[PDB]
Ligand binder design. Structure first.
Ligand code: HEM
Ligand code: HEM
Lengths: 155, 155
């Protein structure tokens, strides 16, 4: 498939060159920027299970040696789908089972891959150890778990 | 900020452990999976400029030695914002100036960082060389550029 380009009518008289030069000139390891990452992983079976790791960040350095790994939300469910607004807008899960909010996984990059790969091969153990090391109780039903709350009706 | 967790009422009697074990067991370098990445970079000034690189992929190997770098859409504009559906759902640009569709940047990871960093410091030249090497004409106004089309009214 050949590359196609869409432009706002305000830039009709610009070239790619004159647009990007202007964008580059009007913009201003991180410093001093806003950056955000969304990773989506899903299976190939029907009603496929999926998960999303996401985070965003301010500006400059490690906080445990990762730039794109500044992850603070982790979500599990089924049916990854494209967001409104097109492919550029990333993904959402159609069926959301569990969402971890303010779960700082930045320090498990430099362990998150072992956790995600484990998950894909039927093994939650490394993910569970990461969660336990943050003080999360993984052996309590969600209904009794203090930091957990139920979504209204379905999402 | 302390971690909080949200769950669908169907999993009220599950623990994190029994949920993730079940999810792990019902799931099934890539093989044989659906994976997707969204990178968002924005400035810290008012009406901040922003860009989004996004792609997704099927299953197993290099196609020029990158897994998360399987990028085929690139979008420039202003005002990065959170998608409907919460932080997990990633970002969109409120003001979209230009979108490159089916622009395969996977082979510029192993050059994309030099391009993005250039952009941030007022220099489009490395981005323009990547585009030129794909056969894109960067010195033609969008209105005359054959592969380009105008968005209706504003987006
Ligand atoms: C905006 C588009 C960008 C894209 C598409 C992109 C993509 C990537 C890819 C594919 C990798 C290696 C593999 C992976 O992601 O798993 C990577 C690594 C890395 N990138 Fe970027 N990147 C972008 C912007 C930036 C910027 C602006 C910076 C720094 C100012 C940066 C800093 C880094 C660093 C430090 C790594 C090494 C691993 C890490 O700490 O995450 N990237 N990027
Ligand atoms: C689902 C959650 C995942 C997260 C949050 C995540 C995050 C990251 C991060 C932070 C890096 C290095 C820096 C960067 O992204 O720029 C990375 C690199 C890498 N990851 Fe992942 N990853 C995930 C899933 C996976 C899976 C399932 C695989 C393979 C089956 C994988 C394979 C790789 C490889 C090969 C690299 C080296 C650079 C590249 O080719 O992109 N990742 N990942």
């Amino acid at each position: 498939m050949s590359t196609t380009i869409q432009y706002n009518s305000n830039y009709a008289d610009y070239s790619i060159s004159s647009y990007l030069r202007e964008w580059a000139n009007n913009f201003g390891g991180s410093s001093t920027l806003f950056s955000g990452t969304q990773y989506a992983i899903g299976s190939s079976h029907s009603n496929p299970e999926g998960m999303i790791a996401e985070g965003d960040l301010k500006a400059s350095f490690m906080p445990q040696h990762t730039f794109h790994g500044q992850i603070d939300t982790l979500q599990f469910g089924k049916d990854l789908a494209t967001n409104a607004g097109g492919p550029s807008a990333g993904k959402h899960l159609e069926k959301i089972d569990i969402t971890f909010n303010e779960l700082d996984l930045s320090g498990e990059f430099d362990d998150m891959h072992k956790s995600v790969r484990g998950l894909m091969k039927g093994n939650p153990d490394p993910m569970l150890e990461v969660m336990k090391a943050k003080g999360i109780n993984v052996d309590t039903a969600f209904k009794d778990l203090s930091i957990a709350s139920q979504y209204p009706d379905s999402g």
